[PDB]
Amino acid sequence: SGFRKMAFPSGKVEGCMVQVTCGTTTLNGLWLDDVVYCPRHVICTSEDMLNPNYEDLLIRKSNHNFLVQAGNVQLRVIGHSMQNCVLKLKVDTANPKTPKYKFVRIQPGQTFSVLACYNGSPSGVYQCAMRPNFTIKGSFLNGSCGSVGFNIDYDCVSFCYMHHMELPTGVHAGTDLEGNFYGPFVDRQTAQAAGTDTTITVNVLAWLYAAVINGDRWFLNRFTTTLNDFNLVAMKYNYEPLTQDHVDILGPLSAQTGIAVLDMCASLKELLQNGMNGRTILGSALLEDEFTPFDVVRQCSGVT
Amino acid sequence: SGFRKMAFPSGKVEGCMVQVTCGTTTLNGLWLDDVVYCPRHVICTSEDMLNPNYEDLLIRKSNHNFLVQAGNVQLRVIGHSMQNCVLKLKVDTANPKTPKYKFVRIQPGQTFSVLACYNGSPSGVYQCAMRPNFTIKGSFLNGSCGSVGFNIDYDCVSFCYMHHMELPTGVHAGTDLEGNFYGPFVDRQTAQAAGTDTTITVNVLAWLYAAVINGDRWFLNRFTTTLNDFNLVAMKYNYEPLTQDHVDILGPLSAQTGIAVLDMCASLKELLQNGMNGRTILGSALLEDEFTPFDVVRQCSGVT
Ligand SMILES: CC1CCN(C(=O)Cn2nnc3ccccc32)CC1
Numbered sequence: 001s002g003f004r005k006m007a008f009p010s011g012k013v014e015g016c017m018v019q020v021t022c023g024t025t026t027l028n029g030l031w032l033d034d035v036v037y038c039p040r041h042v043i044c045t046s047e048d049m050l051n052p053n054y055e056d057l058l059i060r061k062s063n064h065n066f067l068v069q070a071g072n073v074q075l076r077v078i079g080h081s082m083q084n085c086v087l088k089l090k091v092d093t094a095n096p097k098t099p100k101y102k103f104v105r106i107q108p109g110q111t112f113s114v115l116a117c118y119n120g121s122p123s124g125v126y127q128c129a130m131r132p133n134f135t136i137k138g139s140f141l142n143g144s145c146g147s148v149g150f151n152i153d154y155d156c157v158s159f160c161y162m163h164h165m166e167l168p169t170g171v172h173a174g175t176d177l178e179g180n181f182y183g184p185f186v187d188r189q190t191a192q193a194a195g196t197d198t199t200i201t202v203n204v205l206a207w208l209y210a211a212v213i214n215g216d217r218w219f220l221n222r223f224t225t226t227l228n229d230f231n232l233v234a235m236k237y238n239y240e241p242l243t244q245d246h247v248d249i250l251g252p253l254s255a256q257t258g259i260a261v262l263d264m265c266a267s268l269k270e271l272l273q274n275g276m277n278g279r280t281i282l283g284s285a286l287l288e289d290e291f292t293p294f295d296v297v298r299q300c301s302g303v304t
Numbered sequence: 305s306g307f308r309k310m311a312f313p314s315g316k317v318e319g320c321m322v323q324v325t326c327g328t329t330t331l332n333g334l335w336l337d338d339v340v341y342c343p344r345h346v347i348c349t350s351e352d353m354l355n356p357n358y359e360d361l362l363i364r365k366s367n368h369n370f371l372v373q374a375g376n377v378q379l380r381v382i383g384h385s386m387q388n389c390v391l392k393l394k395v396d397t398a399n400p401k402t403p404k405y406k407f408v409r410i411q412p413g414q415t416f417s418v419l420a421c422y423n424g425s426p427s428g429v430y431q432c433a434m435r436p437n438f439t440i441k442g443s444f445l446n447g448s449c450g451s452v453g454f455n456i457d458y459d460c461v462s463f464c465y466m467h468h469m470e471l472p473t474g475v476h477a478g479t480d481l482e483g484n485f486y487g488p489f490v491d492r493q494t495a496q497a498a499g500t501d502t503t504i505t506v507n508v509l510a511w512l513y514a515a516v517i518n519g520d521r522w523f524l525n526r527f528t529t530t531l532n533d534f535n536l537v538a539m540k541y542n543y544e545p546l547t548q549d550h551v552d553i554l555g556p557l558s559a560q561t562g563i564a565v566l567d568m569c570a571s572l573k574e575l576l577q578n579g580m581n582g583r584t585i586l587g588s589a590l591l592e593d594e595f596t597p598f599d600v601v602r603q604c605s606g607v608t
């Protein structure tokens with residue numbers, strides 16, 4: 001029992017972190033096989049970042065201008081290419097610690113762990129979610145760029161995020177490992193406002209099921225609702241509309257607890273309309289939306 | 305910017321996890337040098353756990369009765385001894401992945417990361433605190449025993465906790481790496497109630513400083529207080545009494561923000577007396593107490 005915001009063990013990803021320096025800029029790189037992936041803005045001086053023409057800036061850079069250090073040892077750069085907003089640095093040595101891996105572009109609402117790094121060294125690991133407005137609410141300081149987000153299924157690491165920027169609002173934006181930004185953000189030091197940060201309804205429901213499984217039951221009520229009725233309330237509270245796909249994904253949680261998905265939707269509707277009344281659910285005074293139904297199942301079953 | 309409940313990177317600890325089986329019981333072990341540490345209750349059958357005489361039960365066990373498997377390979381057990389509530393299994397091979405390490409007994413209020421494991425394999429990592437009643441609020445299922453808590457300072461892992469049990473209230477109890485339980489708990493399946501779970505005042509104040517550093521300032525008020533006046537309010541709200549030692553430890557946060565410790569105490573006093581009024585601080589609707597002043601400094605400075 002007990003339910004925590006748990007991250008994946010970071011060891012497999014720690015073995016991939018390297019430091020990348022170009023000119024006066026240093027950030028993190030991800031070394032997989034004989035390729036080091038990093039944000040293309042490593043070629044930018046602080047002034048370049050205001051209005052960069054990455055193609056033009058890259059022309060002035062040769063393989064020897066990218067300094068890649070793995071631990072206390074330098075990697076030889078034998079090639080470089082720009083794919084979207086990431087640079088791919090071909091090195092002469094395959095990472096001996098390369099785990100089994102995939103590059104995956106996640107959907108909003110999906111969660112992942114971040115290994116925050118500085119100078120190619122890990123500082124910490126935390127769990128977060130891709131918000132519906134394609135930002136993440138991380139913990140990143142200057143130098144954290146190139147830090148990655150990932151999920152792990154048994155022995156395969158699926159990298160889903162690479163950190164690139166902080167918006168003026170203090171929220172974070174980044175790319176998948178093919179260098180494509182999540183959302184409309186561009187790697188430019190220009191004011192970019194985020195859209196509405198709606199609540200991930202299916203995740204709140206999964207977390208309510210997690211709460212029932214762990215003994216927190218006070219919020220269970222005598223009501224039920226329909227998807228349409230629930231969605232009228234969800235719209236009013238800036239919650240994502242719930243679909244039959246979300247109901248299907250909550251099936252195993254509904255089966256384990258014996259609480260029908262629509263009954264849990266009615267509990268959530270009452271919590272939205274009445275608030276918590278100073279009460280808590282799994283040590284939280286607000287409705288938690290950064291646990292997917294898969295996260296709840298994995299944590300409650302002990303998947304390794 | 306951004307502030308997360310961050311855990312230490314778990315890689316150094318993942319390299320130490322092993323599976324220990326004795327009879328029909330399987331749990332986790334910590335392999336450091338040529339010694340494997342695990343909860344002594346691994347020698348217990350489910351019936352033994354009700355009223356175990358560990359000394360008598362251990363007599364019936366020989367080195368060959370403890371099966372230690374590291375990954376897919378078996379370690380040879382050449383010795384065994386019981387130290388308090390942990391077993392020390394001497395193996396014929398030193399763990400090649402042994403990091404620099406220390407065994408430390410932490411004080412209530414101190415935080416650490418837990419690498420939850422099942423069958424010697426890691427499932428996840430999360431950050432928690434030793435509660436003032438010497439319990440921890442973790443996420444542990446049957447088979448998680450032997451999972452460890454730790455802190456990391458640069459390259460040295462300080463192990464502070466080993467998981468042993470879940471109380472009937474769903475909270476967790478365990479030992480330091482010398483096998484001494486935190487608090488009054490015993491490794492017996494007998495009802496053991498926890499004492500008052502008071503709030504770690506110095507940690508709440510550190511988290512309020514973290515909130516100011518990250519832009520959340522709405523709770524800053526025009527008041528100040530004294531240690532004695534603040535402590536009258538803290539007693540009323542089941543908060544730990546604040547001492548000059550706590551004020552001293554908050555010094556660097558007070559200096560960075562320019563907000564005197566007693567002014568922050570006055571802000572906290574108003575938050576205790578008035579509540580949050582539906583507002584949030586660093587994405588939380590309650591006062592967070594599982595970040596130490598050292599955690600706030602480390603996260604806000606990017607220590608690797
Ligand atoms: C193109 C250019 C945009 C601006 N920028 C960043 O925002 C980098 N960054 N990322 N996370 C941060 C947290 C604190 C400070 C800076 C941070 C650099 C690259």
Ligand SMILES: CC1CCN(C(=O)Cn2nnc3ccccc32)CC1
Nearest residue numbers: 353444445446468469470491492493
């Ligand atoms: C002496 C004897 C006491 C009872 N006991 C435990 O509580 C073990 N344990 N630890 N974490 C758990 C989470 C879920 C279920 C069981 C759990 C086994 C050892």
